[PDB]
DNA sequence: CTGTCCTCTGGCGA
DNA sequence: TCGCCAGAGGACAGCGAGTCAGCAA
RNA sequence: UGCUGACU
């Protein structure tokens, strides 16, 4: 579906039709699904994701005179564009047709209602006007939403437009999907420049990219040291901090040292260098002074208090919680789940170190995901809201420190004193493209984030909403290995559509059938279903040996240890649910089962991703004929015929929708591309856009 | 790095070369081993060496020499590495065993294998306080870079049978390392005039600079030849004369100016 | 290309679709025959190996 | 109770390394037992039989 | 001194059941009695197996009826693994 | 293959539950010297609190405590359900009862 | 025969060179041996292998 | 990224 | 008993030409 | 002056 009604051979009797010029009743729907990832991401970022972003937003308490004041942001709301104040007449709405005639930004009003209290018994809810945030064109906060092609012609619009862009000074910036490592998945890496991080570090380590509700991202690295010990590197505000593990594990969980140990030796309970190295982690740095959860939190609090910039009246135990909440495993609410996830990433470094597992290439799309326009927008919005709080209360603390009793008279005159901020910062990220942030947003790139979308042709324009940039830093590299066109980008990136000069292999384009996931679902009844299917909870009684069992993960949270002879049936049952839309399994969950043999293959286990930024692509599910959607990592463990008569009985689990599914939208406009040599189809793709 | 000496074309030389090739290849403790058996503060170790059926054929080794190697070099490099770790942590069987423990204060007694290295273990003990871990890691990271015996710089030889059609009878003893003097002893097995190497710093040290000029020129020519390109010799002559102007092979780079 | 000359090309292409097992096997120096799954396992081992010079062979 | 040689058994954390004869009571709950364990922990382990070895690999 | 667990004020010790002679230690130690640990999904209705012959070894599919709908449950039976949950029973010997 | 006839005599009101204990630090070498005390919340009116229970185990050297609420309450008590089967070998009948699993842990206070 | 780095096209992490081919498939077609010509075009997998080689060149 | 250049850097018989 | 053969990492400095445009600080 | 595109 969504690829039915695809023409079988082209026609010419549509031109020369008695109805050629009559504007149609509804828009095309195939052209609409091109910029769909740019619009459905913003729709979340601005309505459902903004509430979550402001919900984290720790209440900004600080000291005034001898008083402590708390300010929390209860809601933030962005309004469609409109004539400034009422100083104008006859039409409140403001349609993108202008700001292209004039040269201006299509910007909506962002306003929040802060709530300031003095010890929690004196309080008043003021509604400040934060600033102006740019708006996408058909984005639910725009005035051209829900307009048929005929009504879209009386406002001067294309009658076939799909916006997915911003108008910053009338220039139509087109923020494009950048490539991120992955989200909520531990990638074991062998990078030789890591041993320079300290005296005894090795070139082994599992990295994790954590994202919470699309508003926060953080990168944490577990490093292996030659002694058998594991360190944890976290970054706060662009500074790298190294905490021995054990300090982290004891803080997160009030469990005995033996129970923490019994967890990090789950699958290798016969190995003795490991058993000895786990004990060195628990005793060597933690029986040295701190043996209760609080003392660990207290010691960790004192060392990190200075650089976490915590409140002075905060107990050290409270400053430790601040570090764990804001720097390690942002995605998981619990501290018990954060412990089990740090334990599986370590259990994996021990397997990479002992050569029982294969390093995950960071440059394979198996271990890659995309950064959409809504993730960048919210992740900047949230950071700027926190900065606004900080600046208003800088002004507060600095003005007078004077008898707030009567000073409740100018409280609004105070908040407005710094509410003059949030507007120009936002336009810089859009007009210039480069990012000025205290934390780089867990991004790794600070330029080329937004680019000009130029309508030289409609094949230059349509290729800005299907571009995927490996990164802007890779344009400066001696080695060329992020330019290799690996066989794992089959159906997800076009082989032919790549710039053919300095940007080659770095700027790719999605195939016609590929698509970005953007929906958000409940995923709460899934952990309770996995247990009905045969999984045994992380708590215990695996029924086997922890080595003949698969570690089940679901979006960063380890459900735990499906038996080894139940993993295949569980994966097939879960795949049948998603295909037939049973249970509540999202139609796009990736049920992956990386089998385990004795060979140094990728680390075994049943993963189940359902996050909102992975690439998926349709394939005709044989044995059901029900048009499944598979992902970049789920496609490596399944056979997908292309033509029929290539389908076999045991082989050919799936089948592809059309034979030319592999090629991009532009590469599908080249006639007979099969009989030309390939460097020529790469120049045709670049010449059809000039 | 490489070498190529023609083989002298005499019946005796052809026979001696087989032994020569088998003599210069490196044999390393790790290339001759089956598996270790480490027990652990009293750390025992049995090496369990390979049978001669499939490694003596092209390595020219004998078991007494191999085992004697463990007694005098490996079993003391082992204590050397144990100290490397512990400095920053906080009728006839009899004479051999005795001299060996005369020199070290940790070992107790090894074994003997009167029948083709049947069971050859050792025992150590540090009784007071040492970091008892899977020290197999150390005794395995060390049993790889431990080589029985090798000519310095040569990693393997090989006789590429034919190199000519005009006088097809030519034989060449190519090598994948570089040690010029360690071939001078075979001036009757191999032709030491016609010796060639791609090093140009080693030639410049054994034969002089006027002999390195021609190696430079021939190297540039053979680099261009693999692509069919052919630069005129009058250019390489000038480049080699400038590089070797002041008596040494000087680089054509930022430190040459 | 002449017909009656594309028939030979087609038969040669058909013959070329049977030369993988022998090639790989006789390059792993495996028993000359009787192994049809030991060869896949040996190829997998050579592929996940550390040195990776029995794979280039 | 069935925790081996580095933990407290009754309690939870892991004991310290041996110096004086008595089990080294932990910084918390210093109860002591089995000053020196009965048998020194003995370990049976060896290497692999494909690459290091020229044996076990005549054919296969 | 062992800091003795101190019961919070909102909790009270539950007396043993002298009306429970079933889970009595005596009943459970009978030569013809075997104890089994059963783990099931949270939504599992044990009544759906009433009268049905659950296996004591291996793996078997057992069919159950709940609310008119047929359910099939894979039942895995095993040898107790060291470290499994221990059943507590009232004992007259323990005061 | 040996099989048993399944019967859920179970709990009369479901108020009745058996008690399973698991120790976080392994197996107790001498479970015979342990005294277990089960504590229940006095608040029977609050559905949330009425099922809160504490299990305490006292030894000569240490105390263990398990709870079915709060951080110590673990996921397995809900995602999965635990039962105890009492098999009569002679009759081949298995009586099945609801069980509550307590994860036991050591006691110390500053 | 397609050759990227002087070697055949690389395999995935599971042992298959392309989603269409079984893992560790012996046929030369699975290793980049293109028997098609530009006269009568090359099927979709050979077009991908040819694209990896043309991109290696650029 | 890769190379030289550079700056040390403590370690056994004379 | 520390000088010189060996031995280690750290630092720096290079990374093809030449064009055209826009946008923004 | 810089970042984005682009040409051989």
Author numbering:
A (entry chain B): 5 to 694
B (entry chain A): 1262 to 1301, 1313 to 1362, 1496 to 1662
C (entry chain A): 804 to 860
D (entry chain I): 7 to 66
E (entry chain N): 8 to 102
F (entry chain M): 6 to 115
G (entry chain A): 918 to 975
Publication excerpt:
Eukaryotic RNA polymerase I (Pol I) transcribes ribosomal DNA and generates RNA for ribosome synthesis. Here we determined the structures of the human Pol I in the pre-translocation, post-translocation, and backtracked states at near-atomic resolution. The overall hPol I EC structures reveal a more closed DNA-binding clamp and a flexible one-subunit stalk.
The ECpost structure reveals characteristic DNA–RNA hybrid and catalytic center in the post-translocation state. The “metal A” magnesium cation is coordinated by three highly conserved aspartate residues (D592, D590, D588) of RPA1 and binds 3′ end of the growing RNA transcript. The cryo-EM map of Pol I ECpost reveals a rigid globular core formed by ten core subunits. The RPAC1 and RPAC2, two shared subunits of Pol I/III, interact with each other and pack against the wall of Pol I. The TFIIS-like subunit RPA12 has an N-terminal zinc ribbon (N-ribbon), which packs against the dimerization domain of TFIIF-like PAF53/PAF49 heterodimer and the lobe of RPA2. We performed glutaraldehyde crosslinking to prepare ECpost followed by structure determination, generating improved cryo-EM density around RPA43, PAF53, and PAF49. Positively-charged residues K197, R1663, R1659, R418, K423, K424, and R429 of the clamp are brought into close contact with the phosphate groups of both template and nontemplate strands and may stabilize the EC during transcription elongation.
